[PDB]
Paper text:
Here, we report an approach leveraging structure-guided design in the discovery of novel, small molecule-antibody hybrids, which we term “chemibodies,” to address therapeutic targets that are poorly amenable to small molecule or biologics approaches alone. Our approach uses high-resolution structural data to rationally design small molecule-antibody hybrids that are capable of dual recognition of both a surface epitope and a deep, buried substrate catalytic site of the same enzyme. In the current study, we embarked on a structure-guided engineering effort to discover a superior inhibitor for [name] (DPP-IV) enzyme as a proof of concept study. We previously reported discovery of a panel of mouse monoclonal antibodies (mAbs) against rat DPP-IV that could complement known competitive small molecule inhibitors.
To confirm and understand the molecular basis of the activities of these hybrid chemibodies, we solved a co-crystal structure of a 6-PEG Fab chemibody (8, n = 6) complexed with DPP-IV at 2.77 Å resolution. The structure reveals the simultaneous dual binding of both the small molecule inhibitor and the Fab, with the linker also being largely resolved. The CDR-L1 loop where residue Asn30 was engineered into Cys30 shows no substantial conformational changes caused by the mutation and addition of the linker, as compared with that of wild type 11A19 Fab alone. In fact, Cys30 maintains the same rotamer conformation (phi, psi, Cα-Cβ dihedrals) as observed in the original Fab crystal structure with residue Asn30. On the small molecule inhibitor side, shown in Fig. 4d, comparison with sitagliptin shows that the trifluorophenyl ethylamine portion of the molecule is largely unperturbed. The piperidine adopts an alternate pucker due to both the modification of the compound as well as, likely, the influence of the PEG linker. As a result, the small molecule ligand portion has fewer interactions with the protein as compared with the parent molecule sitagliptin. The 6-PEG Fab chemibody (8, n = 6) had a measured DPP-IV IC50 of 0.56 nM, a 212-fold increase in potency over the parent analog, 2, and a 32-fold increase in potency over sitagliptin. With respect to the antibody, 11A19, the chemibody results in potent inhibition of dipeptide cleavage by DPP-IV, where no detectable dipeptide cleavage inhibition was observed with antibody alone. This is consistent with the observation that 11A19 does not directly block the catalytic site, but instead partially blocks the “side” opening. The chemibodies not only partially block the substrate path but also occupy the catalytic site.
Numbering used by the authors:
A (entry chain A): 39 to 766
B (entry chain K): 2 to 30, 33 to 113
C (entry chain J): 1 to 10, 17 to 78, 83 to 99
């Protein structure tokens, strides 16, 4: 009995997790048998919040619910239709809990792009046909905040293709005030950003394919422009015209092209805005105070703090999140230290010249995230324990005595759990811990003051008993040392793995900037089929360019994508070959996104190591991928700065060297991210070079190739490919 | 499980008629009505959740088909209002568990 | 607002094409004078009281109902989108 392709694809072994939503400092909403229940952590009791029958009034069309902080009204979301990675339109209707009836008067319009409640109370703000509206109460008629909205040209409250994807990780660009006085939001102008057109074939019944278009900026092209406003919603009236107020950007960033990259209310009358230059090695933070007398927002340069980078770019993917103290007088942030390691730093609102910040943590390891901030303490995920970059543990530093640094999750189950996450309550009195590997995931309820386990939310005992009689793979997380530096790797070893045998090897690569494909988390996936059922070892290596091990490693591939990380993969495979248990004749490399680009570049290096490989949705040329991401690591593609390196690092130029390998190129026709064009060009270059390869398009699939039937088909197609490449 | 629907009724211009599903043999406590016109397909009117008074209706069956339930009596009531020629139809009741699990025998309102 | 259109109006096999993607499709068999009974749900599951010859298949817009080895007015309805809607017959 082995974990089969069928098992992966049909989800027979289900890895359960525990989703809860904190609604107060002692209570969370959890879902059970489709009923929303309310559990109080302070006592032991559970009540019923919303019964499944109320969802069933809309049959099975409900995709989500969302409750008002005060608990009087619920947004039932139905008719979800996806757009991009985060974006979608949906219809909403407000269920009034007290009354137990749908609010049928002045209803939320259909095709609504983004709706969210205020942080307190029950005020609504929505985005519809690109304009922001706001309802003070559910029954009241809506108030139109902006009217500049146009399809694909002007976006208010919602994000552009590239802002969504690359800076915010969300369709939302509107943020409510802490007590609901103001509604901050960003506006993006897309006039002049060139369009990526592609064919959409749809159903059999559609006689003529439809051309889909998106304003999408590529390396060097005309980017979008941004404007940040704030509007007062307490003065919302049909009698008086609503005036939004425009906070303008810093002088430092307005000189050339720039991005808005963070929005963070600190208090009622203060909001922080980080902006970033288009080069991305310089970033400015602007703390902006509200002047009540003349209703303008002022951003002093005494209040402007600048983080920059000489070694590469700012942040993992952008400047880190500001966590401000209760009085707004100081704030905490993950910033890069003297030796390159990113740690927590304490700033002040005012910017004394000599001193940027005070580093409260330090060492050869990185703070992954700041999780909560009390007056007494700060909680944070870090990878310090046991010098394992791909490990995560909860820590708690006391604001007063930084000597008082306590690791809350390190030794609870040291064998089962080396990768934790956490979700703390409104004022942090309680928290849920989620161990995500290397054992079966375990979610448990704890009290903050002294870590005492109050409950066990989910221990995956069901999956455990299902997997007890299955021959699963092992997982070796360890390292090899090249040039006096440790570069970690993970290997999904087959069941009953013996060092006296020679197994085939598959390298699963991503290898992008700030990537980590070797860590302690637990995954049931294609690799586990490949190890258990096929006896393929699947290894992944985090060489240069990988994150969480100091900037010296991460910025090592700066201005030079397709070089040091590409050869580091090739080198790793050599290092594993030296370990002796790998057959040199059967070594493979596969990957998706950046991984696909890396696999294509490794296959074309002429190294002689790798025999075959599969690129899925790959990048071929860096001038095709979007500006915000591409330019973060390469600069512009112009002679003034780095055009040669865009030219040096294309898959196309290495087509001659594909004559030594077996290549399987795959791409979805309706990919809006890494457009099909990129694979269309790789194929054209291989054909011109007289190279036989294999290919598979996927009609109407995006970057995910996520559709249930297409998903089953890609992984079955690739499995058969590897089956032939390794002679079974 | 069976639902002995009320006998057929005759109605004329301007008037309002009430109809009873009379569910039995199952743990009552969702119920929906579909209007079927003769020679044509089925069309969904609305839903009542019998435990509470919670009602959801179709677009523009506001006014028509006021759906209310009082649990004590083993039944559900659909009041169609201001009937015209179009409102003359078969009107079934149903029980909703995953889809339309069981159906009432119909009233031929005229 | 979703429109189910059934091709044939006739192993005979009727189809349903939906105007948009439905998660699951339900089927109801009817005869003249008599209230309809549940025949198929969750795309392919045979409802109780229905002979084993019957099948269901297809995901997205194109669903299909396959009566194996036909022997002696089937409607198709969806509730993945609101409001719920029925096929012609
Ligand atoms: O029927 C309808 C009813 O359905 C209701 C709901 O069900 C639908 C469920 O939807 C499911 C929700 O998930 C969608 C939202 O969550 C997913 C969260 N992902 C992340 O955070 C990942 N981030 C990692 C970091 N990062 C990047 O590196 C950016 C970079 N561009 C990456 C990249 C680099 C490249 F070099 C490249 F070539 C391509 C490429 F993409 C950003 C992405
Ligand atoms: C609704 O909850 C009840 C009672 O807890 C449960 O038995 C039932 O299966 C649930 N039904 C659905 C459709 O989720
Ligand atoms: C739990 O019980 C207490 C009293 O024991 C009650 O007053 C409280 O409101 C209950 N809350 C929940 C969420 O069950
Ligand atoms: C968008 O930009 C164009 C020029 O790029 C300008 O003419 C137009 O006013 C702008 N519109 C808005 C709403 O910003
Ligand atoms: C950022 O990098 C550019 C090269 O692309 C360089 O000219 C500029 O001086 C750098 N600025 C800082 C602050 O490091
Ligand atoms: C090791 O260092 C040498 C010279 O310092 C350099 O050329 C080589 O590429 C380095 N290799 C790795 C894997 O770090």
């Amino acid at each position: 009995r082995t974990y089969t392709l069928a098992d992966y694809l049909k989800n027979t072994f289900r890895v359960k997790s525990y989703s809860l939503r904190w609604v107060s400092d002692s209570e969370y909403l959890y879902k059970q048998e489709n009923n929303i229940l309310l559990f109080n952590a302070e006592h032991g009791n559970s009540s019923i919040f919303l019964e499944n029958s109320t969802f069933e009034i809309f049959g099975d069309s409900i995709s989500d619910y969302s409750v008002s902080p005060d608990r009087l009204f619920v947004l039932l979301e139905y008719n979800y239709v996806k757009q991009w990675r985060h974006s979608y339109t949906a219809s909403y209707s407000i269920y009034d809990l007290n009354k137990r009836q749908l609010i049928t008067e002045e209803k939320i319009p259909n095709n609504t792009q983004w709706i969210t409640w205020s942080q307190e109370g029950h005020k609504l703000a929505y985005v519809w046909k690109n304009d922001i509206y706001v309802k003070i109460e559910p029954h009241l008629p809506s108030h139109r905040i902006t009217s500049t909205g146009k399809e694909n040209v002007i976006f208010n409250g919602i994000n552009d293709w590239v802002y969504e994807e690359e800076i915010f990780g969300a369709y939302s660009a509107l943020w409510w005030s802490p007590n609901g006085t103001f509604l901050a939001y960003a506006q993006f102008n897309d006039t002049g950003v060139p369009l990526i057109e592609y064919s959409f074939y749809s159903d059999e019944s559609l006689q003529y394919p439809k051309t889909v278009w998106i304003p999408y900026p590529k390396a060097g092209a005309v980017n979008p422009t941004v404007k940040f406003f704030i509007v007062n919603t307490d003065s919302l009236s049909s009698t008086t015209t609503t005036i939004p107020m425009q906070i303008t950007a810093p002088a430092s960033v307005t000189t050339g092209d720039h991005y808005l990259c963070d929005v963070a209310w600190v208090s009622e009358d203060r909001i922080s805005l980080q902006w970033l230059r288009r080069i991305q090695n310089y970033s400015v933070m602007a703390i902006c105070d509200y002047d009540k007398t003349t209703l303008v927002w002022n951003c002093p340069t005494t209040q402007e703090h600048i983080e920059t980078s000489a070694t590469g770019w700012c942040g993992r993917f952008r400047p880190a999140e500001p966590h401000f103290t209760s009085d707004g007088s100081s704030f905490y942030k993950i910033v890069s230290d003297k030796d390159g390691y990113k740690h927590i730093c304490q700033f002040q609102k005012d910017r004394k010249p000599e001193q940027v910040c005070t580093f409260i943590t330090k060492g050869a390891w990185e703070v992954i995230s700041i999780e909560a901030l009390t007056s007494d303490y700060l909680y944070y995920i870090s990878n310090e324990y046991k010098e394992m970059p791909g490990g995560r543990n909860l820590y708690k530093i006391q604001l007063t005595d930084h000597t008082n640094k306590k690791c809350l999750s390190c030794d609870l189950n040291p064998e089962r759990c080396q990768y934790y996450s956490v979700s703390l309550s409104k004022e942090a009195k309680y928290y849920q811990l989620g161990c995500r590997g290397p054992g079966l995931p375990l979610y448990t309820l704890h009290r903050s003051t002294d870590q005492k386990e109050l409950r066990v939310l989910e221990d995956n005992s069901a999956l455990d008993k299902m997997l007890q009689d299955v021959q699963m793979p092992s997982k070796k997380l360890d390292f090899i040392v090249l040039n006096e530096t440790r570069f970690w790797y993970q290997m999904i070893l087959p069941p009953h793995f013996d060092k006296s045998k020679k197994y085939p090897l598959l390298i699963d690569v991503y290898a992008g900037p700030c990537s980590q494909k070797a860590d302690a988390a637990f995954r049931l996936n294609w690799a586990t089929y490949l190890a258990s059922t096929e006896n393929i070892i699947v290894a992944s290596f985090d060489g240069r360019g990988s994150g969480y091990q100091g900037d010296k490693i991460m910025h090592a591939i700066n201005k030079r994508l397709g070089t040091l990380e590409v050869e580091d993969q090739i080198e790793a495979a050599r290092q594993f070959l030296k370990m002796g248990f790998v057959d040199s004749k059967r070594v493979a490399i596969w990957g998706w996104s950046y991984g696909g680009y890396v696999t294509s570049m490794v296959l074309g290096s002429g190294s002689g190591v790798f025999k075959c490989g599969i690129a899925v949705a790959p990048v071929s040329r860096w001038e095709y991928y979007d500006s915000v991401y591409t330019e973060r690591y390469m600069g512009l593609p112009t002679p003034e700065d780095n055009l040669d390196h865009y030219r040096n690092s294309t898959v196309m130029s290495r087509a001659e060297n594909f004559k030594q390998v077996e290549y399987l190129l795959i791409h979805g026709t309706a990919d809006d991210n890494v457009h099909f064009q990129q694979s269309a060009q790789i194929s054209k270059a291989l054909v011109d070079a007289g190279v036989d390869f294999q290919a598979m398009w996927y009609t109407d699939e995006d970057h995910g190739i996520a559709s249930s039937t297409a998903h089953q088909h890609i992984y079955s197609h690739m499995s058969h490919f590897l089956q032939q490449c390794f002679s079974l | 499980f069976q639902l002995q629907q009320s006998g057929p009724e005759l109605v004329k211009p301007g008037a309002s008629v009430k109809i009873s599903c009379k569910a039995s043999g199952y743990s009552f406590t969702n119920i929906n009505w579909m209007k079927q016109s003769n020679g044509k397909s089925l069309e969904w009117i609305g839903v009542v959740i019998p435990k509470y008074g919670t009602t959801n209706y179709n677009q523009k069956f506001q006014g028509k088909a006021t759906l209310t339930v009082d649990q004590s009596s083993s039944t559900a009531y659909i009041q169609l209002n201001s009937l015209t020629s179009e409102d003359s139809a078969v009107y079934y009741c149903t029980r909703f568990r995953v889809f339309f699990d069981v159906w009432g025998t119909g009233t031929t309102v005229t | 607002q979703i429109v189910l259109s059934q091709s044939p109006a006739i192993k005979v096999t009727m189809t349903c094409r939906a105007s948009s993607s439905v998660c699951n499709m339900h089927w109801y068999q009817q005869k003249p004078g008599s209230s309809p009974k549940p025949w198929l749900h969750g795309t392919s599951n045979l409802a109780s009281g229905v002979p084993v010859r019957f099948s269901g298949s297809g995901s997205g817009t194109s669903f299909s109902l396959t009566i194996s080895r036909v022997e002696a007015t089937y409607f198709c309805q969806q509730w993945s989108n609101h409001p719920p809607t029925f096929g012609g017959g």
